[PDB]
Structure 1
Amino acid sequence: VFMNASQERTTGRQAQISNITAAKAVADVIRTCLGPKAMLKMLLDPMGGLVLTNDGHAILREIDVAHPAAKSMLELSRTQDEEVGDGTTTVIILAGEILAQCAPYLIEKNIHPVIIIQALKKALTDALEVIKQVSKPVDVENDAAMKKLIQASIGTKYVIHWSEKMCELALDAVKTVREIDIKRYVRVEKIPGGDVLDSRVLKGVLLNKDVVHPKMSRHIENPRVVLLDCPLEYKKGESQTNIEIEKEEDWNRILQIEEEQVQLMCEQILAVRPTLVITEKGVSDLAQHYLLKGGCSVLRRVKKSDNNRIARVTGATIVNRVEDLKESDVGTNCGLFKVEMIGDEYFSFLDNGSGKACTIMLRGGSKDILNEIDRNLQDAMAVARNVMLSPSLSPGGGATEMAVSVKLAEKAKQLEGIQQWPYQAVADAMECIPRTLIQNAGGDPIRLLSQLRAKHAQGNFTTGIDGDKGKIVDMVSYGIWEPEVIKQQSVKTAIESACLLLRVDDIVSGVRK
């Protein structure tokens, strides 16, 4: 052998085409999932589940892609979700028509890639300054002005029907985790049936465990709470202890030490005047007797992550060592403990001071369509958390994108030379969002892009498309405004993308290691 054989080399313009081809035909599978008139691409996963949504990244995420340029494209909607939450659809459509409007028109006119990258790198530094100057800063704590945010960002996927409730559930979830937040202290326990109008953010945590002993109370008024990082049975010697019995009596004395060890725990647990005791590990069948006589309803084996969630609500701190259980570690101001029964299965609630973790109870019409709502609420809770960090808002609905078009269409003419061709094709690219927004609506794109581009030049930044109508609309008067970081990152990575794939001129296949 010379190299290794069984190696398909694609070189030159030949290799270039393969990348732009795939990257643009990636946008194609999601083009009809943009905006309001968008659809639901129902997906069959590998091992037998089902996913059917709009959430761009959740569609791609469940597609297997082989051609590296599309493997690079799909794993690029991942960066977007892992930063903002919404805009995972947009990113890929731009990533495509930056490579589409830009590349073939000008790579097949002999222009060298490395000039194009420098040309498209300037078009971003320019594009970001445009978005930030066409946006308007917003009051993050005008509780009702922030609901207009969320109202707009859910007005896309099947959840619209009940936006009013969802925004209250989204905004009230982020309100009680704010010093700045992390939306993973927010368990979203999905419970099938009822209807959405039954969903209620609980300032607290919900558990699927029942009280370990029948006699223990299923209703405590104001429970003092202890949280445990340790099992409630006798531990063994971590030093491989073994017992060698000689005398007759020896047996009972030891076999009670374990009976006593638990009573030494229970005496130490109960010594903090508790009424509730929750453990990460399992609870003994003798531990329940001494905690019944202690008057404490006990909960066993509860998720490690659910403990940090509870300890944040109740205010108590979790301790591994029973020996050193202090006065601080008890649940001051948890207003209630109940075990209500939601048709067959027992759930334990913890309701009512200073919260910093929260449980979203969701109700729908199936365990299947519930997930598709959670996919909408996660995209809702995201647009609310963005804004509290980056207080500014872009005027969306194609308007922010068209703004970047004629600002870059002016800058290109004023640049001239050779660097102009690639630069005048990011301006070409931006209009693709309006273009698909007219399309998904169903109006004539050319007729409406015309009355959009020119009606933007001397007609304000906030001039975009109304989804359901398919007409030009001043987005100030309408109420579609997308958070500023979405428009920022969307344009950021989508170009960072097109400028990674352009550097490719050669594809060597069959590499190994």
Structure 2
Amino acid sequence: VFMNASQERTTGRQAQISNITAAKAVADVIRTCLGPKAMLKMLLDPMGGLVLTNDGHAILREIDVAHPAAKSMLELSRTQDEEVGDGTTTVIILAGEILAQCAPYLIEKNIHPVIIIQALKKALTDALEVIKQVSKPVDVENDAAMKKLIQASIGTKYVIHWSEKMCELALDAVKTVRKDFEIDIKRYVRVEKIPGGDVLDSRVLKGVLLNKDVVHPKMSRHIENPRVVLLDCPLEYKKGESQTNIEIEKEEDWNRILQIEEEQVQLMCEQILAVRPTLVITEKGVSDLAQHYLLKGGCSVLRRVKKSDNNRIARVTGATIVNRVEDLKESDVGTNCGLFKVEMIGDEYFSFLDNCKESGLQKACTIMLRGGSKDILNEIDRNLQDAMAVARNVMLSPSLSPGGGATEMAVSVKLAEKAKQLEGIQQWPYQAVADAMECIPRTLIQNAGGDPIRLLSQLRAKHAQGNFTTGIDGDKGKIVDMVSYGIWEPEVIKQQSVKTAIESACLLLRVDDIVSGVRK
């Protein structure tokens, strides 16, 4: 025989037919996961957990497909999630259609897969132009419009009923992380969960939330003005780096060796008491003896705190990451701490750190979630990532594109009108771009239960005459303009949807053959 190949070489036209059918199959799984009346999806992972959601990205993380063309479609959700954080299902559902509409031609009119690519870049160049023209700017400092902008994505989720609280929850969190350009990052956004409780009393509080309690019982559970000092090192005597081997000759040496173990922990504790802190947060563990004299000054000792939770404390309290204790000064000590208090919950203890609230480093915060169960917490946490992702685009880009499919439908109309004046060989793939852009409103009408035949016919008749902000009401299923409807989305999500969907088609269209089982 010959090399590890040639099992069944899918070559010629049938290879591309399987890819268009495979790419269409990925969109059919989450066809119902779009619009305000979207259905949820419970996926069963093989480890033992469960993922309850409707986001296309979180659905496609858990699924596993043994096909190489569908896996490239699987990776597009990571492009959208780790770029903005909203519209992942929009990316997957649009590309499917682009690959599908271009297929008739590939299969029958024999246009080679390179001429379609040249047609799409001019469509991509024109798509950014009309998306730039259709979008209207909006003021960033208007809190009334910002709340309606944040809740546009929440409306397609379960917590639309609590949208009055989530917009206030997300707006306060984004402004805390926002640095005075206007760059923010979600790594300090703490996703700590508390099972049980009501969503109404759930609120954001400035500062951190630990899972641990104090070590000694005599520690003060209520401090007016805490002074936090971060420690990295072990506060206990440690073995040390080199090969050591003390050799003891006299009887007065072993008690001296055990006595210097007590005096070294005294020396590091006494220099900590030069500034007299109230709360000492150590990264690594703590000894039972050093804690005892940390007590003889008025400090408070905690268990080992992982690094992550200390970098947030450094920005909240204003302290610095300190390992060498001999170089401890008064300037690097945290201050302006609001309040200290420990609540009793049956799961674990929880220590609260509040801030005085009154440029410098960006402040961190922890968002309290009080759901119904464990899956409700993970469901609501992903909604905050989808809701807070919307708040970044308006700050980075003041443009605001219309929602409800009006933006993509505007791309469909202009590409359809300009396709007549684009006479040549590029006309057939260029006109097929509009056929897929008019599907993302078609999916909303199908989920709403209406007839998309007459609605889209009524849409195109009023889109040219009425206005550029016309769209479909997902709840009622009638034509309602986005100006009166009062729901808007950013323009950045529309750019990534058009760019990622077209750029994905240019990769997959160049596939000629599929050969499986070569080597590792």
Q: Same fold (TM over 0.5)?
A: yes
Contact kept in structure 2, 1:107 and 1:113, CA below 8 Å:
no
Aligned counterparts of 2:320 and 2:385: Cα–Cα separation in 1: 28
Deviations, residues 81-113 of structure 1 (Å, cap 9, x unaligned): 111111000001111000011222444211100
Aligned counterparts of 1:63 and 1:305: Cα–Cα separation in 2: 30
Aligned counterparts of 2:108 and 2:271: Cα–Cα separation in 1: 80
> What is the CA-CA distance between 1:394 and the residue it aligns to?
0.8
Aligned counterparts of 2:396 and 2:223: Cα–Cα separation in 1: 39
> What is the CA-CA distance between 1:141 and the residue it aligns to?
2.1
Contact kept in structure 2, 1:98 and 1:426, CA below 8 Å:
yes
SS class of match (2:517):
coil
Aligned counterparts of 1:447 and 1:404: Cα–Cα separation in 2: 20
> What is the CA-CA distance between 1:5 and the residue it aligns to?
4.5
Contact kept in structure 2, 1:36 and 1:155, CA below 8 Å:
yes
> What is the CA-CA distance between 1:7 and the residue it aligns to?
3.0
> What is the CA-CA distance between 1:243 and the residue it aligns to?
1.1
> What is the CA-CA distance between 1:342 and the residue it aligns to?
2.5
Gaps of 5+ in 2: none
Deviations, residues 454-485 of structure 1 (Å, cap 9, x unaligned): 21112211111111011111001102211111
Q: Bigger CA drift: 353-362 or 129-138?
A: 353-362
Q: Bigger CA drift: 306-315 or 232-241?
A: 232-241
Aligned counterparts of 1:417 and 1:376: Cα–Cα separation in 2: 47
Deviations, residues 96-132 of structure 1 (Å, cap 9, x unaligned): 0000112224442111000101111111111111111
SS class of match (2:184):
coil
The match for 1:247 is: 250
Q: Bigger CA drift: 403-412 or 339-348?
A: 339-348
Aligned counterparts of 1:130 and 1:16: Cα–Cα separation in 2: 32
Q: Bigger CA drift: 28-37 or 338-347?
A: 338-347
1:255-270 pair list within 5 angstroms? 255-270=258-273
User: Per the alignment, do residues 77 and 5 of structure 1 end up closer, same or farther by CA in structure 2, a change over 3 Å counting?
Assistant: closer
> What is the CA-CA distance between 1:65 and the residue it aligns to?
1.2
Aligned counterparts of 1:105 and 1:99: Cα–Cα separation in 2: 11
Contact kept in structure 1, 2:206 and 2:366, CA below 8 Å:
yes
> What is the CA-CA distance between 1:236 and the residue it aligns to?
2.3
Contact kept in structure 2, 1:199 and 1:361, CA below 8 Å:
yes
> What is the CA-CA distance between 1:412 and the residue it aligns to?
1.2
Deviations, residues 418-456 of structure 1 (Å, cap 9, x unaligned): 111111111111011001011111100111011112211
SS class of match (2:96):
helix
The match for 1:350 is: 353
> What is the CA-CA distance between 1:4 and the residue it aligns to?
2.6
The match for 2:187 is: 184
Contact kept in structure 2, 1:11 and 1:505, CA below 8 Å:
yes
Q: Which of the residues 364, 381, 384 maps onto 2:388?
A: 381
The alignment of Structure 1 onto Structure 2 pairs a total of residues equal to 513
Contact kept in structure 1, 2:5 and 2:518, CA below 8 Å:
no
SS class of match (2:115):
helix
> What is the CA-CA distance between 1:166 and the residue it aligns to?
0.6
Contact kept in structure 2, 1:23 and 1:96, CA below 8 Å:
yes
Contact kept in structure 2, 1:465 and 1:471, CA below 8 Å:
yes
> What is the CA-CA distance between 1:345 and the residue it aligns to?
2.4
> What is the CA-CA distance between 1:19 and the residue it aligns to?
0.8
> What is the CA-CA distance between 1:23 and the residue it aligns to?
0.5
Deviations, residues 283-319 of structure 1 (Å, cap 9, x unaligned): 1110111111110111121120110001101111120
SS class of match (2:261):
helix
Percent of aligned pairs with the same amino acid: 100
> What is the CA-CA distance between 1:509 and the residue it aligns to?
1.3
> What is the CA-CA distance between 1:239 and the residue it aligns to?
1.5
Aligned counterparts of 2:476 and 2:283: Cα–Cα separation in 1: 54
Q: Does structure 1 residue 498 correspond to structure 2 residue 498?
A: no
Contact kept in structure 2, 1:8 and 1:510, CA below 8 Å:
no
Q: Bigger CA drift: 407-416 or 233-242?
A: 233-242
Give the 4+ runs in structure 1 shifted more than 3 A: none
Aligned counterparts of 1:270 and 1:318: Cα–Cα separation in 2: 18
Aligned counterparts of 2:296 and 2:45: Cα–Cα separation in 1: 52
> What is the CA-CA distance between 1:265 and the residue it aligns to?
0.9
Contact kept in structure 2, 1:102 and 1:429, CA below 8 Å:
no
Q: Bigger CA drift: 353-362 or 458-467?
A: 353-362
Q: Bigger CA drift: 99-108 or 330-339?
A: 99-108
Contact kept in structure 2, 1:313 and 1:354, CA below 8 Å:
no
Aligned counterparts of 1:229 and 1:180: Cα–Cα separation in 2: 29
> What is the CA-CA distance between 1:417 and the residue it aligns to?
1.0
Q: Does structure 1 residue 82 correspond to structure 2 residue 90?
A: no
Contact kept in structure 2, 1:245 and 1:251, CA below 8 Å:
yes
Aligned counterparts of 1:138 and 1:426: Cα–Cα separation in 2: 29
> What is the CA-CA distance between 1:200 and the residue it aligns to?
1.0
SS class of match (1:425):
helix
> What is the CA-CA distance between 1:511 and the residue it aligns to?
1.9
> What is the CA-CA distance between 1:198 and the residue it aligns to?
1.7
Aligned counterparts of 1:261 and 1:470: Cα–Cα separation in 2: 75
Aligned counterparts of 2:314 and 2:144: Cα–Cα separation in 1: 31
> What is the CA-CA distance between 1:184 and the residue it aligns to?
1.3
User: Per the alignment, do residues 175 and 446 of structure 1 end up closer, same or farther by CA in structure 2, a change over 3 Å counting?
Assistant: same
Aligned counterparts of 1:269 and 1:362: Cα–Cα separation in 2: 36
Deviations, residues 388-416 of structure 1 (Å, cap 9, x unaligned): 11121110101111000011111211111
Deviations, residues 201-258 of structure 1 (Å, cap 9, x unaligned): 1110000110011111111110111011211111222113221111110001111211
Aligned counterparts of 1:420 and 1:268: Cα–Cα separation in 2: 79
Contact kept in structure 1, 2:294 and 2:300, CA below 8 Å:
yes
- TM value normalised by structure 2: 0.96
> What is the CA-CA distance between 1:79 and the residue it aligns to?
0.5
SS class of match (1:9):
coil
SS class of match (1:220):
coil
> What is the CA-CA distance between 1:350 and the residue it aligns to?
0.4
Contact kept in structure 2, 1:317 and 1:328, CA below 8 Å:
no
Aligned counterparts of 2:176 and 2:160: Cα–Cα separation in 1: 24
State the superposition RMSD in angstroms: 1.3
Q: Bigger CA drift: 394-403 or 131-140?
A: 131-140
Q: Bigger CA drift: 353-362 or 62-71?
A: 353-362
Aligned counterparts of 1:512 and 1:394: Cα–Cα separation in 2: 48
Aligned counterparts of 1:367 and 1:510: Cα–Cα separation in 2: 41
Contact kept in structure 2, 1:201 and 1:359, CA below 8 Å:
yes
Contact kept in structure 2, 1:465 and 1:473, CA below 8 Å:
yes
Contact kept in structure 1, 2:174 and 2:388, CA below 8 Å:
yes
Aligned counterparts of 1:386 and 1:355: Cα–Cα separation in 2: 19
Contact kept in structure 2, 1:401 and 1:431, CA below 8 Å:
yes
SS class of match (1:339):
strand
Contact kept in structure 2, 1:41 and 1:52, CA below 8 Å:
yes
Q: Bigger CA drift: 346-355 or 379-388?
A: 346-355
> What is the CA-CA distance between 1:2 and the residue it aligns to?
2.5
Deviations, residues 129-151 of structure 1 (Å, cap 9, x unaligned): 11111111111221221110111
> What is the CA-CA distance between 1:192 and the residue it aligns to?
1.1
Contact kept in structure 2, 1:234 and 1:258, CA below 8 Å:
yes
